[PDB]
Amino acid sequence: DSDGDLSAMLSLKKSLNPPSSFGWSDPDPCKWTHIVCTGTKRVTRIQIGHSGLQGTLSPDLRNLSELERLELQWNNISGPVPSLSGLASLQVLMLSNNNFDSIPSDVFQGLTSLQSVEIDNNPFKSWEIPESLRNASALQNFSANSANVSGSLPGFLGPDEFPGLSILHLAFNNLEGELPMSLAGSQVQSLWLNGQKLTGDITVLQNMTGLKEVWLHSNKFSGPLPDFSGLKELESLSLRDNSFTGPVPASLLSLESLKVVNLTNNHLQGPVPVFKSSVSVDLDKDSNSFCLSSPGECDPRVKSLLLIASSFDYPPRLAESWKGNDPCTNWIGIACSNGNITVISLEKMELTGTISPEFGAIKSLQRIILGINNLTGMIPQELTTLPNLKTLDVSSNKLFGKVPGFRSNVVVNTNGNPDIGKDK
Ligand SMILES: *[C@@H]1O[C@H](CO[C@@H]2O[C@@H](C)[C@@H](O)[C@@H](O)[C@@H]2O)[C@@H](O[C@@H]2O[C@H](CO)[C@@H](O[C@@H]3O[C@H](CO)[C@@H](O)[C@H](O[C@H]4O[C@H](CO)[C@@H](O)[C@H](O)[C@@H]4O)[C@@H]3O)[C@H](O)[C@H]2NC(C)=O)[C@H](O)[C@H]1NC(C)=O
Numbered sequence: 001d002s003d004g005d006l007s008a009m010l011s012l013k014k015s016l017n018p019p020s021s022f023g024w025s026d027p028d029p030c031k032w033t034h035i036v037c038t039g040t041k042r043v044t045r046i047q048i049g050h051s052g053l054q055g056t057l058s059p060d061l062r063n064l065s066e067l068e069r070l071e072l073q074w075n076n077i078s079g080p081v082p083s084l085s086g087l088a089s090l091q092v093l094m095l096s097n098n099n100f101d102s103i104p105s106d107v108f109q110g111l112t113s114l115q116s117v118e119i120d121n122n123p124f125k126s127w128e129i130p131e132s133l134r135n136a137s138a139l140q141n142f143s144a145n146s147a148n149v150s151g152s153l154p155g156f157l158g159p160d161e162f163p164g165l166s167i168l169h170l171a172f173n174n175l176e177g178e179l180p181m182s183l184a185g186s187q188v189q190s191l192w193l194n195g196q197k198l199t200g201d202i203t204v205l206q207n208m209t210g211l212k213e214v215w216l217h218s219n220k221f222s223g224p225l226p227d228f229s230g231l232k233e234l235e236s237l238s239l240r241d242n243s244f245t246g247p248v249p250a251s252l253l254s255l256e257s258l259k260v261v262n263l264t265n266n267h268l269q270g271p272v273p274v275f276k277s278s279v280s281v282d283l284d285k286d287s288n289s290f291c292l293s294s295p296g297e298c299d300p301r302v303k304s305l306l307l308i309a310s311s312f313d314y315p316p317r318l319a320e321s322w323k324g325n326d327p328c329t330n331w332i333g334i335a336c337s338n339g340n341i342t343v344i345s346l347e348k349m350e351l352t353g354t355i356s357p358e359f360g361a362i363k364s365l366q367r368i369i370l371g372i373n374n375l376t377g378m379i380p381q382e383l384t385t386l387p388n389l390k391t392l393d394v395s396s397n398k399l400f401g402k403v404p405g406f407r408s409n410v411v412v413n414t415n416g417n418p419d420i421g422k423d424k
């Protein structure tokens with residue numbers, strides 16, 4: 001009630017200790033500068049950003065039951081952020097750019113009206129995004145850049161609990177682990193996750209069709225680029241300084257909405273991408289694994305090997321090795337005679353995926369050695385059309401199906417494939 005608000009405001013004045021000329025002098029805090037109250041003397045707004053404040057924040061803040069907007073940003077307030085639990089009308093919370101040293105796990109408990117949270121640039125002790133946030137079903141904006149956020153990106157941030165989430169900014173924290181698949185379906189429009197140690201692939205982006213701005217640079221993301229054709233509002237895509245593999249997808253190259261793309265410093269393969277003239281492209285020379293230094297089709301041998309790599313799920317070691325346009329110099333697993341590929345030898349490379357029928361297109365092949373990997377599927381019939389093939393070793397994989405009929409002088413070894421001959 002109004003007496004409770006009066007007491008809480010007096011406690012806040014004491015903790016913050018504002019200057020004598022700040023205007024918190026009247027016996028009725030509803031008459032104080034930068035405070036808004038209802039006609040029945042309930043506090044609804046406290047708006048004292050950029051006010052040079054130096055104290056701490058009283059825990060009695062949580063007693064202001066009708067508080068809607070709390071702005072304390074760009075001061076020098078220290079100590080812990082008090083629990084705000086129970087402030088069911090709090091709609092806007094701005095604490096960015098202060099000196100807060102911690103934020104508690106129950107801080108968002110029962111904050112059902114919360115729409116916008118900004119707590120960037122505070123020297124918080126390490127903390128994880130808390131479960132208490134899950135009651136903010138109308139949450140639209142959550143910003144906590146440079147706030148020492150740790151752990152994984154929690155899956156509860158998906159549309160199942162945050163159907164209105166629009167801005168999620170968590171740059172320059174300590175996040176690790178992979179993107180949770182529960183983000184699928186999210187209507188987030190601006191996503192900042194740059195500048196930490198996130199890993200895994202970014203396939204979940206395919207299911208986030210409201211994205212306009214995606215900043216994932218400076219992480220440890222890997223794997224090939226996903227299908228972008230569904231992201232018809234995507235304007236700004238920053239993927240630089242990661243470990244992405246595979247080619248730049250045509251689905252991205254033809255995306256009409258695209259305005260800015262950053263691809264520098266990855267392990268992207270295939271031909272150099274050509275974007276529309278209107279797109280600002282950040283792609284430093286020699287900062288990926290493209291076959292040429294400028295746009296143009298790759299060498300025929302390279303094209304074949306890249307199809308083979310694709311079927312092997314773009315092996316990370318090959319993405320970093322198979323650079324340039326000459327497979328006969330310094331490529332993992334590749335030997336040549338007079339420029340013709342004679343050996344593809346990738347034993348013990350933890351390969352996944354399947355054996356591409358494109359092996360059959362490399363007519364100079366003498367040895368295909370793929371033993372001790374995690375390959376599945378069948379041995380393609382196309383391999384029997386290799387007239388110089390001497391040895392096919394596919395030992396110790398997870399292959400199945402009938403072995404096609406090879407010439408009677410081809411050495412074939414399927415040792416250690418328990419399902420060879422079985423159908424699946
Ligand atoms: C957070 O919000 C949940 C509901 O949202 C769901 O969980 C969130 C964490 C998040 O995942 C959301 O996306 C998701 O939709 C609230 O949960 C509801 O809480 C109320 C009570 O607080 C429950 O109401 C009770 O229902 C009982 C039957 O299931 C019923 O027996 C109870 O009646 C008894 O109590 C009432 C008074 O409360 C009394 O009037 C009755 O006479 C009787 O004794 C009562 O109605 C809902 O079942 C919960 N689930 C819903 C609504 O889906 C949760 O409270 C909230 N928590 C915080 C901290 O804000």
Ligand SMILES: *[C@@H]1O[C@H](CO)[C@@H](O[C@@H]2O[C@H](CO)[C@@H](O)[C@H](O)[C@H]2NC(C)=O)[C@H](O)[C@H]1NC(C)=O
Nearest residue numbers: 194215217238240259260261262280281282283
């Ligand atoms: C992503 O690339 C864009 C386009 O190159 C970068 O934006 C440009 O930044 C330069 C500064 O280096 C500005 O002077 C240009 O005006 C910007 N162009 C824009 C915004 O269209 C952007 O900085 C890159 N992002 C990262 C994280 O490196």
